[PDB]
Amino acid sequence: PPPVRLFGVEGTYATALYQAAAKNSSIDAAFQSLQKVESTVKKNPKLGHLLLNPALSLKDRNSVIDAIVETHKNLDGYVVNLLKVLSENNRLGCFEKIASDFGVLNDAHNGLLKGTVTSAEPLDPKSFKRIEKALSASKLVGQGKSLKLENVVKPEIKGGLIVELGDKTVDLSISTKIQKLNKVLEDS
Template identity: 50%
Template sequence: MYTSRALSTALRAGAPRAPIAVRVAATRSYAAPASPSSNTKPPVALFGIDGTYASALYTAAAKMNALDGTARSLDTLAGVFKKEKKLQSIISAPTLSASDKNQIVKELEKHIGQDKDGVVKNLLATLAQNNRLGVLEGVLEKFGVLMGAHRGEIELTVTSAAPLDSRTLSRLESAVSKSQYVGQGKKLKVVPKVNPDIRGGLVVEIGDRTIDLSVSAKMAKMNKLLKDTL
């Protein structure tokens, strides 16, 4: 059995380097063999570095039949980012040494729960090895998008100036779930966000449609109207 360090050395020595999807999957080769899966292809196309890593992670987890467990581990990590506001700036620092990265990975591994197939551990190791720890938060978000599509979910993002109570969110969910924007057999996933800059009102996003009912948007329209009139 290969150790993670030996495998990483072998990956670095290889030329040319394999695509990211292959590298992430390859780091599982020293553990249990992948179980067959009917479809390991990501359900939607993602872009950017974080999207590429998220897609590679999805493929690796799907091959191990570990999508749900991986999603739970990443949800826990996402909670760490929300709690520790300085974490993103720390892992994005360009001056991090190899020792710093190893220590960061060890700390993050404490929050991934039951990662029995080692998929998330290998993601963290790969990001550290490729100087990409700074994209981790984006990878978590993009993987959530892939899992939502995998589960047939449609994401409803509700942004408000202050946190909304559960009753208001439930009413919004009920109203939107009956609309034309939620297809038959689809599940609605409500994602509340807070942005004081909108000053009041709501910004509702579902699919590729945005309904801006914020106070800031109304003020912008009013200012434009006054400017055009004067």
């Protein structure tokens, strides 16, 4: 019984890392180790990201893994061997993707159903809050699970708002309605 699929390409490292780690939980600890190692990649951005290049070596890649485990107890559990394999497999560059994806799987386990409330201009907090609770208590979320929510600014839309989550959306905005306004009048 796997979680929500990462669907093949290069999430399969993260997929195997989860489903082999999770057989004995520790995925919060493995998760925090992943957060910490992506942090120390980010905390040393010069040649933490600039040294995920493929043209180095096998040996020097393994030594960069040694520098990662050299930084205190940055790695913990399977995630070093993960890197041992990753280093050997030289898929280190697509490591950022793995991180974010494990985060998605993890907060799916928590049930944070990330949403969005697209607009062409940011809005007041009262609207945020009222919408937030709306979806939260809506059949969408079955409760027992959270509900983030992000307003974004979109100029490509002419205003209004659109709610999004669980590949399920509602647009009541302006742009689409103008469109429907032009379509209906486009007949004889």
